[PDB]
């Protein structure tokens, strides 16, 4: 028997088999199943993922809330109900890992770069759980923010390399009024830190406009903006091609930055068109 | 989609071709059965095919791919037997409707990039000296499952450790396929079917009955306990000219981090000249 599913309401499932059976039943009814993976503590950046999913005609939206051990609940659910989301998938760690940590996904060597410097197993955790959610839910499209750009690229590698049939959709970063990318970590910044933190996005938009004068100009403009900020310890500032290989001499790229303010690590990135 | 002719063998090399045919067949009600192979087909493989065929309304996909990722060496990949003409002929005789024969480039356009890391079972038994072998196997099997999206996938008990690892892949990644293990098909004297038996000369083929003889002796000895079962098998292997044993191990049925209770699996690997042969059997201890 298919688990209970009430159309137009928020249906919450905590068992992977339940959400798997309801998703498969809905697919058979002529719905397109959209998956929005999250770790809860939802903010407007997560809601942009939800809204992008909802606009696909025929969509049913599944939002998973799972804190990976390997990479309020009531508040989150209320936010999803207010968005018209019909399915939330809220499994326990033991439901996700009933045999513990066993077969995992090994990322390619991109996972050791950039964010993988301080956290060399983070992406193996992310890709393992993303793979599992994709198999449980079997969505037609899966939605991820561009803010975690290296994650997004590695996800696309997973999908290509394991021949997954899902479409991966990147959704542009949602930003505070001064450009700071949204994050639950922003609230930990004191006022001097929060003022300094706008240097990340300001550096990146300066670089994207400087880029008519070429790659070096784009990088030097971003470095000058970051150098104008106090208490911003830059971990990296890298211009790469769109798939995070070496930047080509012109054309399309991506500029990524990460920095520590006090004990809080912030990331941002932007599209760059060289010349 | 490309062309699909029922009651005929349709051969697709392009992953996208077999994926589109598979999805179209599933959409019309047929259940899709996958039998992954490395070619060089013998009656062991045909038993998997026959098991697949008997599932009602099934369409059978047999894949043939010598997977370079599960080979290290040392020339093992180049030496693997390739008999493509006979393979497709056998499949036509068995009434299989789909053969999937992808190229290396189609499977690995980016080389080795994201891969499957098996659990600790992969570092034991066959994996002890070949620590990357089962990562190769699981990577290729995951890709085939995603390409074909079968309802059921068929593997031999012959390669028992592989089968157990594929059940772990399926469970651990929440794959929506059922894994069917098919019992080992044997020559009249007991020798397990294998695409390596072709490398046994007459003397080695005669000597090689010792593996199956040892294992069935142990299974019967096992009414007297584990030591009795192991010592019976060791005796038979010891009496065999030119069999060099690499391991003889009695484990729990899942080969995992748990001791033997009542039900076990006894596994052997041995070398006859340069030919390495495997076999295994169910063991029931005592009562
Ligand atoms: C910032 C931000 N913008 N968006 C679309 C997203 S999705 C997300 C997330 O952590 O999933 C963060 C953000
Ligand atoms: C403000 C702001 N900061 N960043 C990194 C970007 S990207 C962007 C945009 O319109 O693409 C606006 C902004
Ligand atoms: C003959 C023979 N050798 N072996 C290992 C086995 S397992 C078996 C069986 O019928 O279950 C028969 C045989």
Curated annotation (Swiss-Prot), chain A:
Mg(2+) binds at residues 75-76, 79. One of its GO terms (molecular function) is ATP binding. Pathway: Cofactor biosynthesis; (R)-pantothenate biosynthesis; (R)-pantothenate from (R)-pantoate and beta-alanine: step 1/1. Keywords: Acetylation, ATP-binding, Cytoplasm, Ligase, Magnesium, Metal-binding, Nucleotide-binding, Pantothenate biosynthesis, Virulence. Its main location: cytoplasm. It catalyses: (R)-pantoate + beta-alanine + ATP = (R)-pantothenate + AMP + diphosphate + H(+). The active site is at 46 (proton donor). Its EC number is 6.3.2.1. Pantothenate exhibits uncompetitive inhibition toward both D-pantoate and ATP, and non-competitive inhibition toward beta-alanine. AMPCPP exhibits competitive inhibition toward ATP, uncompetitive inhibition toward beta-alanine, and non-competitive inhibition toward D-pantoate. The enzyme is most active in the presence of magnesium or manganese. Other divalent cations (cobalt, nickel, zinc) are less effective. ATP binds at residues 39-46, 145-148, 174, 182-185. One of its GO terms (biological process) is pantothenate biosynthetic process. Pfam families: Pantoate_ligase. The keyword Transcription does not apply. Changing residue 46 to A: More than 1000-fold reduction in activity and 60-fold decrease in adenylate formation. 10-fold decrease in the affinity for ATP. Beta-alanine binds at residue 71. The keyword Nucleotide-binding applies. It comes from the Bacteria. It is found in: Cytoplasm. (R)-pantoate binds at residues 71, 151. The modification N-acetylthreonine is found at residue 1. HAMAP family: PanC. Belongs to the pantothenate synthetase family. This is Pantothenate synthetase. It comes from Mycobacterium tuberculosis (strain ATCC 25618 / H37Rv). The gene is panC.
């Amino acid at each position: 028997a298919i688990p209970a599913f009430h159309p137009g309401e928020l249906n919450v499932y905590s068992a992977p088999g339940d959400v798997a059976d309801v998703s498969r039943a809905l697919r058979l009814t002529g719905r397109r199943v959209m998956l929005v993976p999250t770790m809860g503590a939802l903010h407007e950046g997560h809601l942009a993922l939800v809204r992008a999913a909802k606009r696909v005609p025929g969509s049913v939206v599944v939002v998973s809330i799972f804190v990976n051990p390997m990479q309020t609940p009531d508040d989150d659910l209320a936010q999803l109900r207010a968005e018209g989301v019909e399915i939330a998938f809220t499994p326990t760690t033991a439901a996700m890992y009933p045999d513990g940590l066993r077969t995992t996904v090994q990322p390619g060597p991109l996972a050791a770069e950039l964010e993988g410097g301080p956290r060399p197993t983070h992406f193996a955790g992310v890709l393992t759980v993303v793979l599992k959610l994709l198999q449980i839910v079997r969505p037609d499209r899966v939605f991820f923010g561009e803010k975690d750009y290296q994650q997004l690229v590695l996800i696309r590698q997973l999908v290509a390399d394991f021949n997954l049939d899902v479409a991966v959709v990147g959704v542009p970063t949602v930003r505070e009024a001064d450009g700071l990318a949204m994050s639950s970590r922003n609230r930990y910044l004191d006022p001097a830190q929060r003022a300094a933190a706008v240097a990340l996005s300001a550096a990146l938009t300066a670089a994207a406009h400087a880029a008519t004068a070429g790659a070096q100009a784009a990088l030097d403009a971003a470095r000058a903006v970051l150098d104008a900020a106090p208490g911003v310890a830059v971990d990296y500032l890298e211009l790469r091609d769109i798939g995070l290989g070496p930047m080509p001499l012109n054309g399309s790229g991506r500029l990524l930055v990460a920095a520590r303010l006090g004990t809080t690590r912030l990331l941002d990135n932007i599209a760059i068109e060289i010349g």
